[model samples]
Target chain A: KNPKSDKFKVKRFHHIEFWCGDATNVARRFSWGLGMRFSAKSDLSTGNMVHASYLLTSGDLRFLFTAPYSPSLSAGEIKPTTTASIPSFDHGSCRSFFSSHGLGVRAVAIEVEDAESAFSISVANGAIPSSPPIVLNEAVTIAEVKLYGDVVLRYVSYKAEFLPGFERVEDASSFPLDYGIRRLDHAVGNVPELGPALTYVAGFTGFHQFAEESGLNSAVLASNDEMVLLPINEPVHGTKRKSQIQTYLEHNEGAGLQHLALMSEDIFRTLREMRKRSSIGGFDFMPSPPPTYYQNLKKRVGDVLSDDQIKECEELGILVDRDDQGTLLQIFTKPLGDRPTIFIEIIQRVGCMMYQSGGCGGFGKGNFSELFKSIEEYEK
Target chain B: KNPKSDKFKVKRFHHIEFWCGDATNVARRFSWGLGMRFSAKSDLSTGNMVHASYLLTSGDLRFLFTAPYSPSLSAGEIKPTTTASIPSFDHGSCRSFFSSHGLGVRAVAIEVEDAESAFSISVANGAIPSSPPIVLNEAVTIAEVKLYGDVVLRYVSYKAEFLPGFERVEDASSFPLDYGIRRLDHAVGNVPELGPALTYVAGFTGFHQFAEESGLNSAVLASNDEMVLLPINEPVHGTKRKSQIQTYLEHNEGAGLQHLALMSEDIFRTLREMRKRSSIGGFDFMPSPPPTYYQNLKKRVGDVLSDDQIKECEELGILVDRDDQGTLLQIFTKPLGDRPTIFIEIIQRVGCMMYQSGGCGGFGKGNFSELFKSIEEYEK
Candidate 1:
């Protein structure tokens, strides 16, 4: 594989696929909780018999939720299948994912300059090829590789429409709850076997280690130029009782997507919007940091945020971390599901370096102990 | 079984449970779509580790959506399990319902005078006993009988709170888009064999046939008095290609709840509220009736609805059916999920009988042919 290949560039995420049965209602949940708007759909009326799929978007985040429907297949309508033996996994069909994993992040798609070469290069580097690159309709070409558990890493290039068969749902309405999120900060995955999984991903995807803490490891991968950050983690035995990654692995029943960090421009405004949903019903945030974190914060980053801002952050459980050049204000959402697994993180960076640089590179490593403690308290 | 056991009465719907992975967000969907209030919750924080459950309510409608989570249990915490042989089905556990069936209505709960007697009577009448009456938190005792497919008829009686473990989630803030729905009009189930299924329910619950059509059979069951109504259905081969019941059974993988008709006092106001969602993306309605249906509507119910009301009805695709005493305004929504299985119905009755007295009786039987035609058009 050519290290200089333009195809090596990891563009921004194309779309994330969630396998479920209630696509429309689930889409509304996102619209209500995260302000994602409906963009397109496919159904029986659109000539799709497999499932009704909904495509929703907010900022640069695109989520494709497909609810699987099993229509009796005629002999002529069925397609042949193939699978690859990836480590710790047997690549099976979509039905298997639904039957075993339930509703979850099935695929993390990234845009690429050359879909074919990207697929080939990853396969050459010990990744399991789930699908050979193929185009649907005249719109997009796609391919996939099975990652840890039931999740897949998808390489795709979109053309005219969402996909080939999707018809635009015009004037799609949504609950007006824009929290000011602008881009995906990072997507983290929790795995039981962190070393091997991290090494496998770093080797295949060309990502490198970014940060590490006691018994926890993280690697950061960015797009060639767009600064699309993906931080991966694996739990390890440490001085603490059990790593947060270990907690996630046990609850999720294996390796899977852990949490998504959404980037917001106005951190305070975004926090206010999220706080508005605190009562009655909507999104839920993790427990606040140990009270001392705020008491010590005015001394550490007094110059970064005003006293009022610090007080508000403390009131809302927002965590802050800093380096010489910049400081990042962040908060974590409680696990959105019944499973104590997947969650969302909201973050805003002040004066950070771009691309594959270390100016503001880590995932608030200083906030780890406090964050983990809060999560453990929630479970306790 | 005592034929005169008043304990067998299903006293209105206490709550319905939907099995899934995310309960809070889905609860917000109800908050946004139905304007229901998120009343209570139970999670690990609340000392319940099975699932983060939510209790939502609007008038008499109570929904308990439980998102299942498998926290690694110590040997001391594990419980025994059992299953029954339904039809063309291998009964699996609750986890299987989520992983295999996806998000669905697993149980329709009803308040009964005596949970123990209800469970015993139903079991003695050929119903599959799923769970014995067990009290939780000394609050509510619950017993269940497996209905067609994986659906359960839950017998329950609430005491002080939602249940023993649930704590109120006060001030739950949600996007306010209430569509004026007040109560559950009727809940319909689609099954493979209508005769046996209906006979089993009637035999156990002491319900009787209230209505029927060419390919669809219906039986109406009331609560202790007339406050609650449940109309059950099974698909039969009809003149059309396939009955709507057959369509649901095949797509849903087995017998399951098909549609829920929600009672709305002001049909026009409810339609207008639903109209606001059409442009953004909250809920989707079934296809409009043929132009001829509207054109001929004036002659059919000219005495019931004025010209302006009929025109508004035509604009929103609201269907109408009438008897000598009253007319029912109704509309259908497309399936909320991918299975083309479950959906919702909005209905308002005018000058009709309350219970089996034929006042506000029947589920738009005169409109069934046209409704089926519209649904068929969607499939075609």
Candidate 2:
């Protein structure tokens, strides 16, 4: 007999597939600059006639980015599932993602024991079925549902290293990316109004808002047992300045990933490594904080960092915020592409109480204002 | 005081703009791999307000690469012109290009003394008017007309380093692309059936066929004085294998740039440099010739090149062709993106005739057979 709690059990992150217009461009950029090595591919030569996919890996983080070879125009080509082998391979869903939302996060797959049961439960609890459960060969069973905007949440149970049909790619560079991005921290999205979307996520995935701030109209939602985290923001109407979230929704044309925060153990080293790559690659980061912010930082972090470390932080434009629990070091990159739709954030947690009761539950409160000001300056 | 010939005269290559899905991705790749420098950009934060564009340059080749922020649904928010300075800057056209053709060349701007006259003549001669001549500040006037597929031919007259609306980006890398591309040789396009399209180019721009081959059903068209060359190709049905032209049209969904040949002074050095960058950047080239082909190459060249030089060609995957006039060294790159639509060809002419009465013309005849075989292997 199955227990009540066991019906909806979930585990760690499996992979994140970014549906792009150009698959190789993203694979090369991430492989060279993001410390990821290309691992596998599914293309025309590999019998993936309609789509071209490239897989990359960095420690526990696995990325399987795909791009449609051609656009599906007629309604007939928009089928959710093609055959029993790929019962839920929604080609048109990915087509619609790039058409409407442009290139950002398209799918985030998480490990689960019973994917079919999870899909049934989500459907019973008002989740929109983006794609049905698919058996990609004998070793894997996968299903997906609409999460927010064009982003899909996939539940997968794969006995193999990956699903079937992908060929190993040996030519991928093994060069070390000195900037250590240990794991995905959280993904943030901008909404015209965040409450409804947050409510839907809560209903479908059994997530709850762990933190909220009325001043900035921001909230952080976490899964039932703290496996998934999504920090969402929407514009509070009639504010003195238009919210950065509103600007994102306007330019992005809909709700999409605003920024992806990646966790790192050594913040100083990560920032330094990225800076060196930034010059040649044009890997733009957000503008540096004013000298006054660092001067005030010395007032706050009296003993956490030595004078040399503090000077290093100031020189590199790294931001530091502290509370009774611990201190967090973070920095933001400029928009990833021309659209200013999505960027990246690098963060380091030093025994910081992120999930427990009565601590800065989501992000740095003092640094939030400074971050908003930086975006505002970028707008100006 | 306009004569019939002087009405729509075009000068040398001004710039080539590639509208893309991921703007920064192409910019970074071209900067690192192609030796092109990112010179300028125009975006929302930069007061472009509608489209995001980046400019890149290598010697006299100035490229104005643009990308739309988001797709326009209908006629509502899409405006062809906004201000007095920019009388006809079409944002939607660029969006349509990316949507239809992905990241191929969207526009080829030809330097002209009078852009308005050029546009008027081309429009009068059946070229679809894409955008009217716009005066960008006091330094530039530009206009565009739709060509085959989604390609646009632009007429540009600028007084400054570039046209006015493009702000100079200072942070762009100044890295040297060692592939010594001096100028453009010719741009090739593949059509399902080439006669009507070739006639249109001839009617609209007054180009005439300079060379033709029955085996591939290909024709090379050039302007009156041979400043511009376009090699037009069509699929010849009932061949043993699927024609590469047919493959291009099928994958690209319509006629688009097949390959752009860039004239290099020393293709050997260029191929060497690209080979070195290929390891880190994944700059892929076409498959090498069989050693049998090299043996045949030695027979045909008849000591035109030393054994050591021929060995160098075979080692670098560079192809060689000879005629009574002289020999030409050529090599091709694989398609730049997922779809097998567009690629690049690097050619070096050593006392070789390109457009005289009787010559080898634009591309190498000896290399064409080998090129087809490479593409066939890719399709298989």
Candidate 3:
């Protein structure tokens, strides 16, 4: 941290945690998705909870997910009610939704510097303070992350910090959002309203257009043909298919926090360190940086550096993407849960600029067929 | 997507998704999380590969996750070796952990439009693009949404779209993290690493501290609360803790996307709709909006609106949080999976511009919390 910036530094970042849709699939992804070897994962009977971790060059991220046990509430006297019992069109839609998925609903929580301060700031900015920041002096608050309206952040117990050799990663606690990760990424919630809902969050969260434009290659290194492709859209109200947008708006008619984004630095390094910890290889065949990329990297670097430098970088298996500030190297891992879309990325920056633009927005041909093979394999 | 504003006019949230440490748990979260009221989630056997989906607000947002029941591709080619090999870890630790919990990993995915554009803007400023754009077709090209190295986003699928309302969410495409989620709320993931491993992910997927300044909130959500209060603790890179952050880090040594953040304009509206379509109660306990808040809401709104308008908003359960901009309201739901951390946020904005001074810091609060109890009951 810059000595001068320390004064303005508010806090650092911890790991970005999420409840998965499934564990078995996630295990497989680790075993194959990213070609990491899994060491162990277990659940505690004391409560429906299990703690797991992933290894990356930067460090490992932990996961404390609940087992497939019946839901339980220690204090709050929760009584099941029919969706029909709720008033408003939003409530009705939400009720039917639960019936369709046959699952209740998922909650999201975040660890923060100060629950109260976080709540205050969130509320001050637009977030509805959930319950004056419930003081969970006992358990690490989770279910009730939000109260009094806006999503509130509570502190949990998870050890996250950067270790040397993990590779160059930006610290989140400082600017939390910058580190290439920027800030909270995105989430899916069940709520009410459509256009208004979108507008509401835009006003509060203060998500900018991310003026720094760029592109992604969505390359699954394992395949030589198939490519993972995705594009980010504007933060506009999801009203087009008004049908579904209206669904979330109804249930979450009351604004609250949803899924999140993880601020990252060296995507590849972080992933490598995570894989090394225990390495969970799921669905096998998941690709890695091609040995060939390392072989031809010297020419790629060109006059930028000597063959020694290129070799050194490749030896670590770092994937580089040049940007306006410099070049950022990163790689993606498989999904932890059931969703094929959600996964992790490991990135490292050299100098350059532009998100996927400038030098980004172009695809690398190193690993395509291989990744596609995995996709077809997955389809089978 | 106001054409007038060249600065920060969100066009449309593309997607919101998550990663879960456990695949099965992710399934359970949806099953019990939503129940048969709001969502109608179910398992769908797509040959060797199977997945589950719960319609949130119907077509608007859908949560889809899968487990490797057959394809077993995730098990990696060395499944026999791994399956036959005993859990890798301290004998006592392994036994206790396995006896209680099983294994796996999960992640979050977000759908967005203009993948290249988003990349360009985000990259130009600071955000790093994991890869370049890989056009799925003429209409779509995907990019990696790298919130945190571990919290990686696999490029979105333009071909993917949410299932229509009443349609089984499990059908190949539902919401599919497409169209896009307003913003990333938060995400969660578990890796096989040690305490230091957890710290490593913290470094990779940048997060802010909640006064965990000394050590690193970037790794864990160590709150100001007494650490000894709970059975959890801080171990080194390698420790004898069951949920030790070190374990996962050591194993995976690589990063992948975990959970995600889904920003909403109106929590009540979004959640309610999700509940209705899915046919379930979005949350275990509908956070009481406090009758008093409603009673004096007019005074709170002051010149913003009339008493009747405030009443209308409150009645609809549109959450509210006060900020420099305005009061923001929000609500939360249970996890789509067993883990409680990865859920969605529904928010309504009065217009507060809180966050970091501009972007950087998130110390105010990271938004992580305990949801075991609430989710447990709701899912059950």
Candidate 4:
């Protein structure tokens, strides 16, 4: 029953890839808006004519944006003959995917001990294979299996700084200001039904249910080593209004990654910088939590956060919640695109720490109602 | 043969609209990168659920970006029933257009004395009508005619600040720093041939040839009042290498808007600010011209520009050229997206002003060879 006993493992998230319309400008928006550095690129200049890809990084977090070239063009003239041995992606599929979901997460890549074994075990356990294990280059190997909706779960085994075909950007410079973002915290997905989605994922990876919440019928799943966490959510039907999860599914045209939570050690400074950037052209956040929620913060969380810290949370529109272990402060940005689909979250955990453990402050179970209320008001 | 003699008049450009995949982020890119102001919006929040549109302005320059909502969604339940009387665009066509051309100018709107006359006369003179004259509101009337490829020439007669269905964005803030950009100087288009395309446009609009260049077989067309200028270019076969115009046609899959030249009074300050932003994820410029070109600047333009100004041009990668009328300083950006199709230009005119003339120093005639060489090198 336990896949970990069979020596199958996914260490952590290697990176997240987005299928976008314009990689150049979208990559620029992420770099300037989120304080990430332009790390590498794979495009026509680098002899890859199928798509233009830009990789951005900050601390341990990596985000990749890829825009496919027009397939109607003369590929035979533009694509080099020498690169025929390289792995070729489906450019037509990429176009259709973008048409359906304007800008969306196409792949959630996870670092694995052995790409071939991880792929085979997952497929053997009923996961649909998207691509067989293939060696990208001398130092990199990858495989993929279909996750929910149009997204894929990728297994990556690499020894180099990044995957093959990406050239290091020599002129890439750091942002003048640091926003203190550190690493990937967790990724949330929205589905029509929670039980089937969780069952499908658990059957492949043996991730155990770690936490649960009521209003959204969410279940948090974590790896055996607790380094990779994925939370699955489903809308509760027959509510007062349409659920955010339901809206996301309709707007995205299918189930997909809803939001990525980025961890920051100092969220106060991070959010402040992000807010200032928002005034110019960065990501805009959701409305603040109700004042009544802040007024009863100490009563709910039992002094896990100091009065000044709580005050700063209210000032920055950060939501705070607690579990038996620790406290968590989180804030969510509005949808990154025109569609009310994908977004981002900034999070900080306090008072629980083990060397390699994943989320210490839990999944903000107590804050769900308050957060949903604000989102509902914003939607109206 | 003169359409203007029949009381058909085009005053100037009203605005340029881009059909994009993500209007929210792309509009932000223009605001932060080019110092445009986010002026207004029409989205789900504003009761326009078919698409999300954002309007940005800087001085007299208006750039509208619109991304269509997914057509697969259930609109009957989400959309209000009362707004069905409004004009509904073909979201399917927009999706296909975006698929063919990643991010492109869909419409180049021009202010006209009478939109009804503009439409009737153009259609009567062999122009294909995309849409008949339609009243957007009591104060705004617009009609569309096929210009070239997927682009349309929009006739606009408006007595309001903007077209109807858009609400003013009160929270929109100006960029903290000013880049000094003023208005659209001219827009250039790439075609397969010069004569037939020029003849077709002139047949409908009563425009005369203002200037011509040999290497690209280009012609600049201006309105009767000399307020609206549009330059058309065609590839010169049997060249040393593939022409830039040919490459644009291949990449874009058809003839389309190639680039837009933005006017500025103080180019030195504007380009300096742009360059600063470019380092941190704004639009990047093409490589500087050859040192020899700058060294011979005084010999070519001859005392029209100061030695200090020439030094500044070289320092900032600005190109300087002059006609018998006056001197012109210009610089071009690299392609704004993955496809080498559309770009931007920053220009300043020195002399040759007749109160309300279009261009003074020609179309950088002497600088074409040098600019082409730089572009060729950058592409390599």
TM-score of chain A of each: 0.85, 0.85, 0.44, 0.91
Highest TM-score, which number? Answer: 4
> Relative to the unseen true structure, what is the C-alpha lDDT of residue A42 in candidate 3, on a scale of 0 to 100?
34
**Candidate 3 — which residues are off by over 4 angstroms?**
A1-10, A21-62, A72-113, A128-132, A138-202, A205-319, A351-380, B1-380
How would the docking of model 4 be graded? medium
Which RMSD does model 1 reach against the true structure?
5.8
Candidate 3 docks with a DockQ of 0.05
Candidate 2 lDDT, tens digit per residue, B1-380? 11123336766777787877777777777666666667776666566665667777665666565655554422254344442123344555655566567678887777887888888888798888988886666678899887678787788876555656666777544445445766676778777778888877778777667743323577766665556777788888777766788778777778878887777767787788777666455468877877766766777675678898888988998888765666778888888887778898888766544443222434686567755565456456
* Candidate 2 chain B least-lDDT 10 residues: B78-87
lDDT of 3 at A149: 27
The number of residue pairs in model 1 that clash at the backbone is 16
CAPRI-style quality class for the chain A–B interface of candidate 3: incorrect
Tell me how candidate 3 scores on lDDT: 0.33
| Each model's fraction of native contacts | 0.54, 0.63, 0.11, 0.79
Tens digits of lDDT, candidate 4, B64-166: 9988877765356433342311243457778888788889899888999888889999988888898788776577778898888889888999664576878
Candidate 1 chain B weakest lDDT stretch, 10 residues: B82-91
TM agreement with the true structure for every prediction: 0.82, 0.86, 0.31, 0.93
| Every candidate's chain B TM-score | 0.85, 0.86, 0.43, 0.91
TM-score, second chain, candidate 3: 0.43
For residues B166-203, what per-residue lDDT tens digits would candidate 3 score against the true structure?
23334322222212234443344444333543443233
lDDT of 2 at B179: 58
Instruction: Let me know the TM-score candidate 2 reaches against the reference structure.
Output: 0.86
